[PDB]
Structure to design on (902 residues):
């Protein structure tokens, strides 16, 4: 009980002043508003002065109301899958002096069996391959050895075709690449095929900027360590390498047996089975690599913005399940320990606990210390303050400066095609191999060809001028937030990929642009 | 599937009145390609329970909606089809009776109640899948498992599709420094155990006849003895009796791709259990042999396929039910003309059903393609593209 808003018209006839009168007059005269005059005439009940006095009053409210670490040289061993590239790489591994090694010789001999397939330093390594079957691959892609000149990383292409991806896009580009060939008639004729994965395994390498190659002829012993077969082998193996792009004069050929160990550790005087060869041994040839001068100490190969691709994510004690150990390649820039790396995808960051440059050495447990690495090098990092989920492979890490690195779904790529059985139809599915990632993709559409609209046949690139093997739009079938990737231009190992239909590799290309 | 009635009214020669019963998810996919938007479906539901408001208050009943169709929620793997609509209301009081007019309504399909389709564009292609497949004998027999060195996928080869069931995966050995930190082996054992458990649950040695195991590498062979080890541990005679439904194969990639490498490639399957997989595998084979050997005898695309029909040059016209029922009616007037035009210049025809791998493969080619009798170089200039 409150506010009395009667009176309202009823009173006008009760008192008898009409009201359509004062209205106009005052209003105009004065110059305020309506509503006040009706209230005031009720509140002084039909007055005409005291309400006007109030009005003369009213408006009155006034509104109306450094130090250089020396390498330490990395190599990738390449080969068909049956030359005994493993038997030969394990012999280079053995103990880097050698023998003494007395436990490891026994342990290799234990590795099914101590009596069965008997042993001479390598047969025993081969029996470690037969045990290792039983959980596919028991020894590591980490391997290192030393020589009189240098400390060597080997990563050894399989064994069932996977470690060749562990080198290129994979770690530490290779100062020198090692092609291991079988001297046998059927095995050299096989392996060597244009179609072989072996040619591809060599083809990336040459594309990558892997300038030195050493070619090692295994399994000499079956072909009686022959002069004529060896010179006949050098004569095919080289024109094959030139078709790849390699410089045949620059390539060393070393005759060897991983299986007896002749020409591996000491020169082929130790090999009485060949008297005619006079030249260096397979460690002597690998060691033969020219030392680049490390820095420019504090200096460049990217000063440019840091881009590190993540090949693999794996847990560790000190370094988490991820933001844990991370493995991949330094696409551009540089990284050093104790530094902060930022991962745009997870919007999280971490501190580099340790950095393993190329050649796989210094373990996490023993030491914690080691200086520094430029683009092109692989690293195995250790990340301190970040969580298992935070980094997945395909992510690119960088600093806050020129940070984030950006990332997405389908992309545009200038692929070039090779000799295929089938061609690429627009819409055809293929398997893309960037780094660790191998995924199904659809080459949806074929935007352009040489410069026309068509399907994509063999050997197609624009003949002259702009090169248009094919302009393509490639979409990832597998998963939303499909894949992280970078253009080749800012960094190529993130950018370069291979396309293969079933078994065969149909094409390769560079990623030109990123789309949603 | 079971069809209770199916009738042909007397003032309307075309469309129909279908009363029908889906029996499994292969019949949920058939129904899919039959219902069109604006067709009217009449079901039972349980649309009981209310606000409060006057009274508590409700009742129950068992009220059926004659609902106009407007859209669909379809997930084949999840064995779920639902049709969204507004009530037709009903209709005279003769139907919808009890239903409250003004209220969208949906029908989530069950294998136990029949329902009736008041159909407008009931065609001979639909009638084939409603009286052939509709296949009260059922010949589709297959399950797969594709596996890389690190991921595996339980799958189900369907009367069209390579439907995933379970994108399993464990912590795969990456080759550790030491002799292989027993971590690798332990991790591998857990994995063997994991798939076995999955397949044991997912599969049912009662309706299936083929199980395909494929991998790049020994991984498929390993998984087959791991499958049967753990069977002989559980004494699982749903798997041990059927040691002869398993077939171990190699494929380039251990992703879904491997399925179309094994099925359509004459490596494994020939004419073993192939019935609904027959023909359709070979023709899609040859199509990619031809197009892809850059011989101009295999073509894709509405333009090029209409062009290859002006020369009469078509030997096998390829179309899909995915582009057909994918949504639209007018567009198929042309695609019929286009078959007749090409055959009147040359060819048979092959329609791919369509959640299928083969139909998806042709869907990824615009749901239209052809195989020719002769080389026609440049059918893609004149008309402008590739």
């Amino acid at each position: 009980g409150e506010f009395d808003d009667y009176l309202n018209d009823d009173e006008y006839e009760l008192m008898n002043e009409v009201f359509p009168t004062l209205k106009a007059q005052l209003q105009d005269y004065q110059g305020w508003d309506n509503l006040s005059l009706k209230l005031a005439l009720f509140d002084n009940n039909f007055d005409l002065e005291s309400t006007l006095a109030e009005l003369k009053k009213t408006l009155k409210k006034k509104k109306t109301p450094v130090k250089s670490a020396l390498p330490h040289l990395s190599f990738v061993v390449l080969g068909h899958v049956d030359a005994g590239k493993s038997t030969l790489m394990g012999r280079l591994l053995y103990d880097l002096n050698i023998v003494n090694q007395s436990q490891l010789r026994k342990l290799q001999r234990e590795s099914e069996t101590m009596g069965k397939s008997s042993f001479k330093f390598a047969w025993i390594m081969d029996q470690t391959n037969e045990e290792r079957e039983r959980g596919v691959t028991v020894s590591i892609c980490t391997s290192h050895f030393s020589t009189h000149r240098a400390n060597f990383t080997i990563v050894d292409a399989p064994g069932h075709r996977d470690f060749v991806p562990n080198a290129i896009m994979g770690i530490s580009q290779a100062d020198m690449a090692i092609l291991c060939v079988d001297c046998s008639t059927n095995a050299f004729e096989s392996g060597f095929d244009l179609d072989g994965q072996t040619k591809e395994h060599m083809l990336l390498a040459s594309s990558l900027g892997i300038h030195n190659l050493i070619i090692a002829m295994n399994k000499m012993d079956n072909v009686d360590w022959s002069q004529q077969r060896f010179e006949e082998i050098k004569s095919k193996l080289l024109p094959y390498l030139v078709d790849i792009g390699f410089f045949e004069d620059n390539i060393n050929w070393v005759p060897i047996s991983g299986f007896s160990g002749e020409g591996v550790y000491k020169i082929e005087y130790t090999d009485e089975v060949r008297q005619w060869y006079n030249g260096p041994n397979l460690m002597s040839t690998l060691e033969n690599a020219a030392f680049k001068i490390s820095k420019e100490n504090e200096g460049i190969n990217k000063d440019d913005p840091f881009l590190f691709s993540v090949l693999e994510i794996i847990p560790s004690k000190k370094t988490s399940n991820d933001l844990a150990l991370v493995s991949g390649k330094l696409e551009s820039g540089s990284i050093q320990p104790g530094e902060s790396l930022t991962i745009y995808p997870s919007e999280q960051s971490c501190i580099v606990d340790k950095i393993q440059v190329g050649s796989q050495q210094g373990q996490s447990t023993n030491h914690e210390e080691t200086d520094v690495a430029i683009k092109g090098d692989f690293v195995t990092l250790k990340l301190r303050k970040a969580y298992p989920e935070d980094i997945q492979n395909g992510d690119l890490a960088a600093s806050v400066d020129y940070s984030s690195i950006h990332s997405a779904q389908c992309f545009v790529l200038e692929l070039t095609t090779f000799d295929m059985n089938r061609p690429l139809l627009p819409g055809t599915p293929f398997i893309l191999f960037i780094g660790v990632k191998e995924q199904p993709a659809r080459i949806k559409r074929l935007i352009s060809f040489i410069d026309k609209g068509n399907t994509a046949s063999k050997k197609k690139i624009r003949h002259l001028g702009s090169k248009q093997r094919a302009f393509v739009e490639i979409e990832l079938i597998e998963v939303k937030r499909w894949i992280p990737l970078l253009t080749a231009h800012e960094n190529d190992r993130l950018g370069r990929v291979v396309l293969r239909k079933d078994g065969r590799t149909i094409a390769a290309g560079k990623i030109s642009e990123i789309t949603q | 599937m079971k069809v209770i009635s199916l009738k042909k009214d007397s003032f309307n020669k075309g469309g129909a009145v279908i009363t029908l019963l889906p029996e499994d998810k292969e019949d949920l996919f058939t129904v899919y390609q039959i219902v069109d938007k604006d067709d009217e479906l009449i079901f039972k539901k349980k649309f009981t329970s209310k606000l409060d408001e006057a009274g508590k208050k409700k009742s129950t009943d068992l009220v059926k909606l004659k609902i106009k169709v407007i859209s669909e929620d379809f997930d084949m793997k999840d064995e779920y089809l639902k049709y969204k609509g507004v009530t037709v209301t009903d209709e005279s009081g003769a139907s919808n009776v009890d239903i409250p007019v003004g209220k969208y309504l949906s029908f989530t399909l069950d294998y136990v109640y029949p329902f009736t389709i008041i159909k407008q564009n009931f065609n001979k292609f639909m009638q084939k899948l409603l009286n052939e497949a509709c296949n009260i004998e059922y010949k589709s027999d297959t399950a797969a498992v594709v596996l890389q060195e690190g991921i595996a996928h339980v799958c189900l080869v369907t009367s069209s599709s390579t439907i995933l069931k379970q994108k399993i995966e464990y912590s795969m050995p990456k080759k550790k420094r030491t002799t292989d930190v027993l971590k690798f082996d332990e991790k591998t054992e857990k994995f063997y155990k994991a798939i076995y458990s999955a397949m044991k649950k997912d599969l049912n040695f009662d309706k299936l006849k083929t199980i395909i195991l494929c991998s790049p590498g020994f991984y498929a062979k390993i998984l087959m003895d791991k499958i049967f080890q753990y069977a002989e541990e559980e004494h699982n005679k749903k798997i041990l009796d059927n040691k002869g439904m398993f077939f171990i194969a190699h494929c380039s990639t251990g992703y879904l791709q491997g399925i179309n490498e094994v099925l359509k490639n004459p490596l494994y399957a020939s004419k073993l259990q192939d019935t609904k997989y027959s023909k359709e595998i070979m023709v899609m084979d040859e199509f990619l042999l031809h197009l892809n050997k850059d011989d101009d005898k295999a073509w894709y695309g509405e333009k090029e396929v209409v062009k290859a029909a002006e020369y009469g040059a078509i030997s096998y016209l390829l179309l899909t039910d995915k582009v057909l029922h994918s949504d639209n009616i007018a567009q198929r007037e042309e695609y019929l003309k286009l078959m007749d035009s090409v055959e009147s210049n040359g060819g048979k025809a092959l329609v791919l059903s369509t959640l299928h791998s083969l139909g998806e493969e042709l869907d990824q080619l615009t749901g239209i393609a052809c195989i020719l009798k002769y080389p026609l170089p440049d059918l893609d200039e004149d008309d402008g593209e590739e």
Notes: Chain A has four domains: 10-57, 74-287, 307-397, 411-514. Chain A touches chain B through 46 residues (CB under 8 Å). The longest strand of chain A covers residues 438-448.
